[PDB]
């Protein structure tokens, strides 16, 4: 019987660690896949680490050109929360070079995009069989949100986008019942860019905090409900949270307009932001110009009020260590028996040629945290690999 999520998000006071792949550290001898980006999604029986493999293993020669992020060899597989992404325990889910997945209470839905750049298409798997297809409409790179979809009263929702990267695109909200699509509505938003959202249900509205890849330092917000009416805007906080940004004292913030900066306008990184009344637990990378470190900030009235008052801060990586994408998910009632949804987040740490020029491959490793009503401290749970590897020699 279908999984409800018409229940409020839990108030949390600190985030405690839950799992750590150690993928690259084990992969130096073990049979482990090359992954550019992972994510996590939770069913009623377990939570599973999804990831987009690159069809090759670490230290194997077929890992050579794995900086290339779109190819016919990538596939979405899935491993239970915390186990390394190894070759023998990974259950195949989709063929895909950009996907999303989530469990509706009966069976696991996964959306895998494939096909050539100018003519891509998405295949919607449901319990291991392709039930539907969605083709491009502007006939540039089609994308889903690189983290779980949001299921409510048995319908599962997600955002997709087609069009340019450094300029205004087209964005659409989708809705499925037992695989196949039943609704689709376009986001008219002339001032900005909603690429790579991180979404969670909250008391019957799906909330998403996305990635402004054009003229912005600040997160776009999208909020929509049962029959896809929506509100679009920006995370009001007075504290900027994208990767390229000017320091907190220089930024002014806006609720409705993209706020741009000196050299910050054409780039970003995937993040998250849990609303807690009117405050927000906003995650961001410690450095203001590179993907390193990670903070979680509780900004008072940051969801509505251009405030800069950071009430709490945690750190989960220190600034000497490389990081990457981050996203949201929630652990349902079926697991915890709480009368509310527990908010969790994941963090990937990338290693390889985009910054460590001497290694030929590029892979990443996941860490997962969940909210706790008690206060919790921080520490640097970094990936601990020792590059170069034996295939880089």
């Amino acid at each position, epitope marked *: 019987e279908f999984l409800n999520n018409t229940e409020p998000l839990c108030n949390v006071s600190g985030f405690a660690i839950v799992s750590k792949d150690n993928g690259i550290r084990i992969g130096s001898r073990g049979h482990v896949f090359v992954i550019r980006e992972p994510f996590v999604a939770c069913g009623p029986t377990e939570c599973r680490t999804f990831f987009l493999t690159q069809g090759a293993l670490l230290n194997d020669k077929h890992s050579n*050109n*794995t*900086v*290339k*992020d*779109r190819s016919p060899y990538r596939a979405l597989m899935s491993v239970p929360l915390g186990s390394s992404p190894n070759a023998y325990q990974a259950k195949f889910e989709s063929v895909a070079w*950009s996907a999303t997945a989530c469990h509706d209470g009966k069976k696991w839905l996964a959306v895998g995009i494939s096909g*050539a*750049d*100018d*003519d891509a298409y998405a295949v919607i798997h449901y319990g291991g069989m392709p039930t539907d297809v969605v083709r491009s409409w502007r*006939k*540039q*790179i089609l*994308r889903t949100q690189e983290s779980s979809c949001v299921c409510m009263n048995g319908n599962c929702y997600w955002v997709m986008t087609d*069009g*340019p*990267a*450094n*300029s*205004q695109a087209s964005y659409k909200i989708f809705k499925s019942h037992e695989g196949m699509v039943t609704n689709e509505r376009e986001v008219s938003f002339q001032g900005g860019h909603i690429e790579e959202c991180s979404c969670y249900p909250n008391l019957g509205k799906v909330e998403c905090v996305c990635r402004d*890849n054009w003229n912005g330092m600040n997160r776009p917000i999208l909020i929509f409900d049962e029959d896809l009416d929506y509100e679009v805007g920006y995370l009001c906080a007075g504290i900027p949270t994208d990767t390229p940004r000017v320091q907190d004292s220089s930024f002014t913030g806006s609720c409705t307009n993209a706020v741009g900066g000196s050299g910050t306008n*054409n*780039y970003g990184v995937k993040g998250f932001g849990f609303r807690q009344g009117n405050s927000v637990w906003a995650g961001r990378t410690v450095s203001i110009s590179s993907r390193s470190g990670f903070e979680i900030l509780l900004i008072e009235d940051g969801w509505i009020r251009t405030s800069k008052t950071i009430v709490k801060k945690v750190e989960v990586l220190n600034n000497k260590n490389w990081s990457g994408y981050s996203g949201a998910f929630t652990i349902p009632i079926t697991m915890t028996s709480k009368q509310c949804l527990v908010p969790c987040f994941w963090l990937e740490m990338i290693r390889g*040629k985009p910054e460590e020029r001497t290694s030929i491959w590029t892979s990443s490793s996941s860490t997962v945290f969940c909210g706790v009503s008690s206060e919790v401290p921080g520490w640097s749970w970094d990936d601990g690999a020792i590059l170069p590897f034996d295939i880089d020699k």
Partner: antibody
Amino acid sequence: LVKPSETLSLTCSVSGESISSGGYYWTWIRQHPGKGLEWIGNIFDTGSTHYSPSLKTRLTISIDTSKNQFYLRLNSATAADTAVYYCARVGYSLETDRPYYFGLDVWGQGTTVTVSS
Amino acid sequence: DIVMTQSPLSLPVTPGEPASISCRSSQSLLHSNGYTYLDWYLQKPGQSPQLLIYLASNRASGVPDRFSGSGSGTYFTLKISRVEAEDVGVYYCMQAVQTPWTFGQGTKVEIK
């Protein structure tokens, strides 16, 4: 016709699309009689520019988004600057985590600039 | 700049048979973001150029299904599976790796 050491300039226009739609880079491209192609330079919709080094001292390239037009100016034109001049569009981007490139997919008709007295 | 060189300066051909043209660059075209930025363009008699192939391997939209591309590193190839009377023209390669883009010398195709 253009006489030597004058300032050459040319106008190219866009339609169906608009400038500042689709995020293309607008390009100028040359062809001397009997020879192969050459590349002059790129403008982005928001005015950021790339130039070929051999012509960088001579050139100035600009958009006007209110007119859906974009422009080439070439100072001190020599007789050797005689060519067919083409203007094109090309969509690509290298920053993002999902790069793309759809090379010079649309070309306008050529203008046969003759630089002589 | 990348210096571009392209081996047949004229290629005699005749409808119905396969044909090939090939290209070599003075540095490898493998960009740091993993993609290989090489194109082929076709200029028919009294016309502008036209796009055939927009990265090493990929055909453009609207191009007839008869063309094919291959190669990596420095050496690239254009394949025509069957040549037909609409294929006469001058074929240029191009590279888009560096800040100055450079075109090849231009293989003429002459029916025999």
